[PDB]
Design a protein around this ligand. Structure first.
Ligand SMILES: */C1=C\C(=O)NCCCC[C@H](NC(=O)[C@@H](NC(=O)N[C@H](C(=O)O)C(C)C)C(C)C)C(=O)N[C@H]1C(C)C
Lengths: 242, 244, 244, 241, 198, 250, 233, 212
């Protein structure tokens, strides 16, 4: 066949690239950072009415000050989340302090390229790259609120707002206009809830959409349905307002 | 590298099938037929010796019926060589169970272990499956007389009557046509031979082309007994059942 | 059929190893380098193409020493060249450690020889993309050696490899004929500088930088050393003069 | 030694080996699970390509991982054993180290993990199996029903089915199960399951086995009669119209 | 040591075990239950080294329950004990051996007979009408050797134990804080909660 | 380096055949003929020493080999494969039997052992099956004399007489005609020489033929005296001279 | 042709080329330009940081390996991290064991040998990143150019990445000038910013876009970003 | 060292001293022998300092990880078995720790587990661990009632450590109190034995032997 760590003549890694594709097919996920916190939103996307929508976990807690949203093959996310949680907890055990949101991200990113069938550099055992991207959001005392995008490529960026998943390219375009250095947390909530409604095939309600955030005061929390619903209702009214 | 010559014996087909398991089975379809029938008072194992000769030393031969335990035996269909490799590990497994619990290994338990070993060559390793299918005939005090079957896939199931190898479909129909829950060993013994007789790719069903075995509880005792008929014993029962 | 050139350890139907042969290509394509065995040592010289004025002059040294008495120069894939020398160094060190005496040129030769030949044995490795001219002085004189990607090597009076390999081999042969009684270390350094300047015509496009090193019993006490300063310029001149 | 990457990405971003694994599930016998208000029921069909088996011994379709949890499946049987084992072993290990039986959700999350792992580990093919895991968390009465697949994904369902013709029966259920008022009775719950299986079983009294699970490790599998009866009472519902 | 007694009467096996947990100078607990149920009709009492004791008992339990689930069957007491012996016997020649002694009492639902097995950390197994580990043996074997009958009712058995416990309290150096008694029979395992004055 | 061939090289084709094993058998077909005959008081095995050059000395090479002092082997197929198979079969006899029971393995089991070896070369990673078929003949106290044939598939079976290699079909037919359950060893030896002549093109004598037997105990071949229970090996290769003598009574 | 000889690095093409290695080298050209140049007292790195959206950050191109050594990357970020991190260990080991600063020249020899190993063994892949290492050691200031092929070269200055040829020609021209910029870091830096703007096109180097690094005689390798570089734009 | 924890109507009381020694040499009178595993879990520390302090801190990390994983507060019984099992992995190695794991989960209520480097894991209502345990036991045992006011229980505890600090040469420094309620543990200050003794003497009239 062809090595799983082979280069394309264009200088890219096939598997990594193809990996990115599986992600485009993934559920939409959006993140917006404000000087008041970071908001994480995702598309539940239930493949049937019988599926108990709340058993869908695409926004998880890494630490009390670090949470994340996933898109793509989500089963792949488990080992990464575990790694992330461990790294964050361990850093605390070794340094008596919280782990920097960037390092947490950098740590996850390090698993990414650890794959192949005999790559000469260490012991990279994992047959293929991860089929999921991550939006890591959090806060620390060195760089305040931060939003990070981690791809199976092994690289990661920091966005003021970023949207990954099926509706991304469009949603991201939206965010390009909507986002500004003075957004409030409340504002970012509706904005996420809005862009989600646009790109979702489904009619956005508090059961196929989920919001959450991270604030220095209360840390990472996942909005319970009731709380999200009201925010949705609120969104509708301000929209129909003009 | 080496990937160039790798058959990838353990992958799925676009239809979700396991190539090698399938092909392995294909191989087994050409192996001498083996039939297992289970009656109220015993079990019967009959198989057809594939390829024979005037010179073949039949008294000293065994290519289909193997004793695993004292209360368990199997009938093979496929690569004899492969079968043995599995039969030996089976014989050992039985002993370990005995050594650990001081009790005779329950039939199903032995059968599950063997099937698991096969199943493995099916999910990892890059090696070919075993070209074998087994008809397990055994007795234990928990389920009494039992009849099981396992194949290259690693799956196993229980039966009242069953066959493996060539012309199974033909035999299954014939068995399904004349089997009755209240059968008696003797009855099963006959039904077995009759079936082979009607499926044999050969001219006539002679003793020199057969291997027979019965698991009965000789009343005048109270213990179960394994009997793997000798050439002459088959030649007799063959005349009796009216196949002379 | 065909495809006998996609894997490293495969024999073509005529008995060849194309991969090795393709390696030789990578070599011939490389810079030119020679070795001249004088009457009490060996002289090494190499062509250093100046890709641009940006290359710090005298800096990217090519000739390597193994231990303290052996010299190595190679044409082709430099990284493979170094890789080989590293192994030679370990190889020489292992030797000295057990036998005390610094490794004999011949023994070292076969040490590199067996290693290289080793990379023509498996499809999981690539052959060396370099030919190496090496040698030094030992218990019984001087020795010059050239090693091919195939693992083949022999003792030479003069040796050359790379782009200008022919011009060189041409000149080296001339020397051998016009000096049956031998060449002196001093003289071999000069002659080498000339032979490099001539061989530079098959690359007269890019400007170059000369690099000579010698190992002479009377000139360097059997130790390998780089020819620098005055003696160097002196040779650059003796060459520049005869190139016109 | 063998570590060939058998599950890899293709241009369109798919992992065919995992996808094909699913195809193996589609070909498997149908399995269904519906949770009532105080119980969960699991039903499975029995193939008929050959009939002359000894149902006493032949391995059944619903397995007990622990006293309060069961797992049924659709796909390759040989593969199901390996999963059921690992689950059972983890069930005990969790008791031993946490001094408390596993929660249905946990046991599920474990199995799903095993499967996922097999989709990104060298030298191995994914499990051609999809599972239904149901029971009651320790000292709890709210029924649990989860489902996992080769991809390594899982989630909970009010009712669900996997296997051949699962498309059909899922529909049946999607328009016969009300979350508002779930089968408030063990009986009416088993009926809904038998009903849902009949849509695809095509009269198979001996081809449909049901297992009822109640709180506090109360697990039991109905016999042909108990089942035959349900089929009986149901066929009349049609004719009486 | 601690007190581990076992007596097999007509239709059941009775196990008595000291409730004291002493560490050096202080008695830390007086209600310790030195027993683990291996299955609905198999009970195992244990005594020995501080950590090894439970670690081994729980381990054995886990394995027995796993077999129960896998086979949807309950291994005979005889079998269970054989498993246990094997384990200890392995342990004895390991890097760090389990220093535990045990009594295994169960009701063989198939044979319909109670059974008592005595096994020490060396993997020495023996089946007895009555048995005990540690010093208790020295004061009780003569008692039972005297007042023991195979057809004794469960009640007679308890009285016989009552007799043993008294002797143990009278002549033994240590204050073992009384014993917890349990009965294994056709209907399973149950604990005689009133023995502190029966 | 490192044998990265951790996968089977012998796999099932859609038809259900195992290519390499089939091809291996083909290799056996091409090989020189060899046969085996079991008499009521011995066994005989023989083949032809197809000297691959008049300069080569056929003695410095035995197609007939002693496995134990009561078991011999002969083949048809790829000489080199047989060679290593013999060494392995000699060792396995010690390692898995004589060292445990202090007695040489009985024919069926040693055979069983060799079979397993071959069976493995049919499934192990990175290897090809053995290109040979073996005819092992021996004797043990509780089984008497016996003759077995082992195939590259790893299969083996007992024979009253049989042949493999080139003219096997021909020879097999000739044996069915001359064999009976009353043959004395000398009889089989004769029949053997006859059966062999057919497959022989040029010279047929004690220098072109190689034959050994498994008959009575040769105390004269023990090497030492003084131990009642040690009577000598039953295996004995005939000498060139011994062969020619019999060829005259052909 | 090429299609039959580029499935792995353990295969030579009929012409003596190692494509997989060449494909890796490509990843570098697809990378953002970065410039390196040195005088006799200092060595400097200037790199163009590339960003995703306008909502994203600009990715770091310069990495510090010790107080006297550092480098700039072009290509696969991950691989730079791996290689730089490995170059940090080597500097570290040189200290801890010999209480000696790892000479730049040696750091290079080390990188080369590390790379080379991923181009002759099955299963391995070359590194898809180019590096420019600068450093001040016992023999002065130094500049190195690292290629995934394993080829490490010492130069006065150079560039790599898309349009790099622009800057490179500019340096090749300015040579005799910047090489004498001793005792003045700011001058050597401006000559570095000029060389790099020679490879601009898309836009013009801004404050959160430009990245500069410098090492030297009494100057520990220090990176400058944002506001810090403002005085050079 | 003296550490004690007892269960009563108002929940759980935990008190410890703060003296650290190296033979007869008092290394410190300011050690924190109570490790706050988390807002609901407390760990006493007696035996080798490092051994307790290190492994109990490690326990905190395992408990945190367990809750991230199971999205639920870890049980006392489980937390105690984690330490228990870890410690047993080192049996014979030389670890030296006698500890108490005390917590309050809605599921278990007030709970106390005794865990020592021996592998001994025990659940109970009262536990005194340390070179001064018997002294603490003396006082405690004879005044304990499940019906103590959170105020009296607090005292009885503080007083039980006071006793041990006095008689035991290896105990002393100061007392540290904690009250365990479902909402978590509530610190109850550091009481210097120096000043606490006298005060108690005068007010209570006990310690009549000593002269002051
Ligand atoms: C409780 C006292 C107690 O329970 N037993 C008395 C033994 C003293 C143990 C402990 N003291 C210390 O930990 C010392 N340090 C060392 O003992 N270091 C050892 C060494 O250097 O050899 C190593 C091998 C552990 C102090 C200086 C930290 C102690 O004070 N235990 C108290 C309580 C737990 C603080």
């Amino acid at each position: 066949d062809r090595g799983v760590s082979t280069f394309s003549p264009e200088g890219r890694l096939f598997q990594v690239e193809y990996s990115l594709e599986a992600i485009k097919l993934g559920s939409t996920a959006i993140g917006i950072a404000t000087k008041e916190g970071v908001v994480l939103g995702v598309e539940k996307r239930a493949t049937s009415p019988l599926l108990e929508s709340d058993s869908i976990e695409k926004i998880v807690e890494i630490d009390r000050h670090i949470g994340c949203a996933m898109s793509g093959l989500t089963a792949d996310a488990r080992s990464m989340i575990e790694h992330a949680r461990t790294a964050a907890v361990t850093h605390n055990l070794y340094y008596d302090e919280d782990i920097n949101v960037e390092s947490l991200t950098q740590s996850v990113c390090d698993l990414a390229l650890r794959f192949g069938e005999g790559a000469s550099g260490e012991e990279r055992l994992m047959s293929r790259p991860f089929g999921v991207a991550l939006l890591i959001a959090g806060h620390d005392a060195d760089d305040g609120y931060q939003l990070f995008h981690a791809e199976p490529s092994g690289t990661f960026y920091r966005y003021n707002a970023k949207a990954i998943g099926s509706g991304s390219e469009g949603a991201q375009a939206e965010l390009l206009n909507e986002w500004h250095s003075s957004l409030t947390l409340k504002e970012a909530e509706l904005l996420v809830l809005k862009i989600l409604k646009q790109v979702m095939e489904e009619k956005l309600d508090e059961n196929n959409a989920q919001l959450s955030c991270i604030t220095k005061q209360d840390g990472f929390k996942i909005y319970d349905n009731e709380k999200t619903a009201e925010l949705i209702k609120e969104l509708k009214e301000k929209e129909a307002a003009e | 590298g080496s990937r160039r010559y790798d058959s990838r014996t353990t992958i799925f087909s676009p239809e979700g099938r396991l190539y090698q398991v399938e092909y392995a089975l294909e191989s087994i379809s050409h192996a001498g037929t083996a039939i297992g029938i289970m009656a109220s008072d015993g079990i019967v194992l009959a198989a057809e010796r594939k390829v024979t000769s005037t010179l073949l030393e039949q008294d000293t031969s065994t290519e289909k019926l193997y004793k695993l335990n004292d209360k368990i035996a199997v009938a093979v269909a496929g690569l004899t060589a492969d079968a043995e490799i599995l039969i030996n590990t089976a014989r050992i497994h039985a002993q370990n169970y005995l050594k650990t619990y001081n009790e005779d290994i329950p039939v199903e338990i032995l059968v599950r272990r063997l099937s698991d070993i096969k199943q493995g060559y099916t999910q990892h390793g890059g090696l070919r499956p075993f070209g074998v299918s087994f008809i397990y005939a055994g007795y234990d005090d928990r389920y009494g007389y039992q009849l099981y079957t396992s194949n290259p896939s690693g799956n196993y199931t229980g039966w009242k009557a069953i066959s493996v190898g060539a012309n199974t479909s033909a035999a299954q129909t014939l068995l399904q046509m004349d089997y009755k829950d209240d059968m008696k060993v003797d009855d099963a013994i006959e039904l077995a031979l009759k079936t082979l007789s009607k499926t044999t790719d050969s001219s006539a069903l002679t003793y020199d082309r057969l291997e027979f075995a019965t698991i009965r509880k000789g009343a005048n005792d109270g213990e179960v007994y394994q009997k793997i008929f000798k050439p002459q014993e088959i030649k007799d029962i063959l005349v009796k059942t009216g196949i002379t | 059929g065909t495809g006998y050139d996609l894997s490293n350890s495969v024999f073509s139907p005529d008995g060849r190893n194309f991969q090795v042969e393709y390696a030789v290509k990578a070599v011939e394509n490389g810079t030119t380098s020679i070795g001249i065995k004088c009457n009490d040592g060996v002289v090494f010289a190499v062509e250093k193409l100046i890709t641009s004025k940006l290359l710090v002059p005298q800096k990217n040294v090519k000739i390597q020493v193994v231990d303290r008495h052996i010299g190595c120069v190679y044409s082709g894939l430099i990284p493979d060249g170094r890789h080989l020398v590293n192994r030679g160094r370990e190889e020489a060190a292992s030797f000295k450690k057990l036998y005390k005496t610094p490794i004999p040129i011949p023994a070292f030769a076969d040490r590199l020889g067996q290693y290289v030949q080793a990379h023509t044995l498996y499809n999981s490795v690539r052959p060396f993309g370099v030919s190496t001219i090496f040698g030094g002085v030992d218990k019984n004189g001087a020795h010059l050696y050239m090693l091919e990607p195939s693992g083949s090597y022999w003792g030479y009076k003069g040796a050359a490899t790379g782009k200008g390999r022919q011009s060189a081999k041409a000149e080296l042969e001339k020397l051998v004929d016009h000096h049956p009684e031998g060449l002196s270390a001093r003289e071999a350094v000069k002659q080498a500088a000339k032979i490099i300047y001539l061989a530079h015509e098959d690359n007269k496009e890019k400007d170059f930088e000369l690099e000579i090193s010698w190992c002479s019993l009377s000139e360097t006490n059997g130790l390998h050393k780089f020819v620098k300063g005055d003696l160097l310029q002196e040779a650059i001149d003796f060459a520049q003069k005869e190139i016109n | 030694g063998y570590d060939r990457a058998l599950s890899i990405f293709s241009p369109d971003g798919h992992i065919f080996q995992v996808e094909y694994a699913l195809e193996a599930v589609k070909r498997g016998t149908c399995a269904v699970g519906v949770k009532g208000k105080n119980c969960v029921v699991l039903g499975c069909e029995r193939r008929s390509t050959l009939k002359l088996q000894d149902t006493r011994i032949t391995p059944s379709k619903v397995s007990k991982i622990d006293s309060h949890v069961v797992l049924s499946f659709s796909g390759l049987n040989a593969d199901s054993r390996i999963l059921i084992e690992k689950a059972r072993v983890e069930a005990q290990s969790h008791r031993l180290t946490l001094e408390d039986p596993v929660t249905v959700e946990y046991l599920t999350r474990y199995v799903a993990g095993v499967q996922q792992r097999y989709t990104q580990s060298g030298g191995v093919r994914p499990f051609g199996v999809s599972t239904l895991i149901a029971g009651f968390d320790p000292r709890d009465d709210e029924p649990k029903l989860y489902q996992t697949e080769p991809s390594g994904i899982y989630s909970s369902w009010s009712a669900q089915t996997i296997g051949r013709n699962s498309k059909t029966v899922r529909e049946f259920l999607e328009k016969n199960y009300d979350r508002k008022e779930p089968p408030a009775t063990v009986e009416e719950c088993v009926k809904l399951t038998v009903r849902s299986l009949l849509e695809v079983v095509q009269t198979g009294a001996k081809n449909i086995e049901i297992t009822v699970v109640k709180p506090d490790s109360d697990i039991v599998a109905l016999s042909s009669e108990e089942i035959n009866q349900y089929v009986t009472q149901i066929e009349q519902e049609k004719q009486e119209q | 040591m601690d007190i581990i007694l076992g007596i097999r009467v007509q239709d059941s096996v009775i196990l008595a075990s000291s409730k004291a947990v002493t560490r050096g100078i202080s008695v830390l607990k007086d209600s310790d239950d030195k027993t683990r149920q291996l299955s609905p009709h198999t009970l195992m009492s244990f005594a020995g080294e501080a950590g090894d004791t439970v670690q081994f008992a729980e381990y054995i339990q886990a394995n027995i329950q796993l077999y129960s689930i896998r086979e949807d069957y309950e291994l005979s007491p005889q079998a269970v004990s054989s498993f246990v012996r094997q384990e200890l016997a392995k342990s004895i020649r390991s890097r760090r051996p389990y220093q535990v002694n045990v009594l295994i009492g169960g009701y063989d639902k198939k044979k319909n007979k109670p059974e008592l097995y005595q096994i020490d950390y060396l993997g020495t197994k023996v089946e007895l009408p009555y048995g005990a580990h540690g010093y208790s043996g020295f004061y009780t074997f003569s008692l039972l050797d005297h007042h023991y009958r195979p057809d004794m009712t469960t009640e007679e058995g308890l009285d016989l134990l009552k007799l043993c416990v008294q002797e143990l309290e009278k002549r033994m150096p240590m204050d073992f804080k009384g014993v917890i008694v349990k009965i294994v029979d056709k209907d399973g395992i149950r604990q005689v909660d009133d023995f502190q004055a029966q | 380096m490192t044998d990265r061939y951790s996968f089977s090289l012998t796999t099932f084709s859609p038809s259900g055949k195992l290519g390499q094993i089939d091809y291996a058998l083909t290799a056996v077909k091409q090989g020189v003929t060899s046969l085996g005959i079991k008499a009521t008081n011995g066994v005989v095995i023989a083949t032809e020493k197809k000297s691959s050059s008049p300069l080569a000395m056929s003695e410095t090479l035995s197609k007939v080999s002693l496995l134990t002092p009561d078991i011999g082997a002969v083949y048809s197929g790829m000489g080199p494969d047989y060679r290593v198979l013999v060494d392995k079969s000699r060792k396995v006899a010690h390692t898995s039997y004589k060292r445990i029971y202090g007695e040489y393995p009985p024919t069926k089991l040693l055979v069983s052992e060799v079979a397993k070896i071959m069976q493995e070369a049919t499934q192990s990673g990175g290897v090809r099956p053995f290109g040979v078929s073996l005819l092992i003949a021996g004797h043990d106290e509780f089984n008497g004399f016996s003759l077995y044939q082992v195939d590259p598939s790893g299969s083996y079976f007992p024979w009253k007489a049989t042949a493999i290699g080139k003219g096997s079909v021909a020879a097999k037919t000739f044996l069915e005609k001359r064999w009976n359950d009353e043959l004395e060893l000398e009889d089989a030896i004769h029949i053997a020489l006859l059966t062999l002549k057919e497959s022989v093109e040029g010279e047929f004598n004690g220098d072109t033929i190689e034959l050994a037997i498994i008959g009575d105990e040769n105390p004269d071949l023990l090497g030492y005296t003084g131990i009642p229970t040690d009577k000598g090996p039953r295996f004995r290769k005939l000498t060139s001279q011994e062969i020619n003598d019999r060829l005259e009574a052909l | 042709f090429r299609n039959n000889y580029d499935g792995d690095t353990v295969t030579f093409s009929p012409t003596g080329r190692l494509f997989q290695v060449e494909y890796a080298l490509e990843a570098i050209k697809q990378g953002s330009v970065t410039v390196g140049l040195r005088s006799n007292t200092h060595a400097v790195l200037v790199a163009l940081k590339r960003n995703a959206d306008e909502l994203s950050s600009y990715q770091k191109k310069i990495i510090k390996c010790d107080e006297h050594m550092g480098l700039s990357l072009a290509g696969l970020a991950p691989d730079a991290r791996v290689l730089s991190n490995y170059l940090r260990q080597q500097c570290n080991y040189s200290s801890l064991v010999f209480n000696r600063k790892l000479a730049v020249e040696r750091a290079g020899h080390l990188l080369c040998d590390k790379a080379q190993k991923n181009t002759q063994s099955y299963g391995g892949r070359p590194y898809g990143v180019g590096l420019l290492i600068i450093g001040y050691d016992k023999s002065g200031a130094h500049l190195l150019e690292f290629q995934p092929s394993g080829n490490v070269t010492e130069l006065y200055g150079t560039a790599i990445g898309a349009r790099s040829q622009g800057a490179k020609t500019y340096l090749e021209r300015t040579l005799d000038t910047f090489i004498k910029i001793d005792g003045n870091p700011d001058e050597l830096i401006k000559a570095g910013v000029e060389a790099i703007s020679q490879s601009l096109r898309d836009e013009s180097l801004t404050v959160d876009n430009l990245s500069i690094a410098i090492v030297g005689k009494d100057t520990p390798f220090t990176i400058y970003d944002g506001e810090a570089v403002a005085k050079y734009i | 060292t003296t550490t004690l924890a007892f269960r009563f109507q108002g929940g759980i009381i935990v008190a410890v001293d703060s003296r650290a020694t190296a033979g007869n040499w008092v290394a410190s009178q300011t050690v924190k022998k109570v490790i706050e595993i988390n807002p609901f879990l407390l760990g006493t520390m007696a035996g080798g300092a490092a051994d307790c302090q290190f492994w109990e801190t490690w326990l905190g990390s395992q408990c945190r990880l367990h809750e991230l994983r199971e999205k639920e507060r870890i049980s006392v019984a489980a937390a105690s078995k984690i330490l228990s099992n870890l410690v047993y992995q080192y049996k014979g190695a030389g670890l030296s720790m006698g500890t108490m794991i005390c917590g309050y989960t809605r599921k278990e209520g007030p709970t106390i587990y005794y865990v020592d480097s021996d592998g001994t894991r025990l659940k109970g209502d009262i536990f005194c661990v340390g070179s001064g345990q018997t002294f603490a036991y003396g006082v405690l045992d004879s005044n304990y009632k499940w019906d103590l006011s959170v105020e009296d229980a607090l005292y009885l505890g503080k007083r039980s450590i006071l006793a041990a600090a006095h008689r035991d040469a290896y105990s002393g420094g100061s007392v540290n109190l904690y009250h365990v309620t479902e909402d978590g543990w509530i610190y109850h200050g550091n009481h210097d034995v120096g000043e606490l003794f006298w005060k108690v003497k005068e007010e209570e009239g006990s310690f009549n032997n000593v002269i002051g």
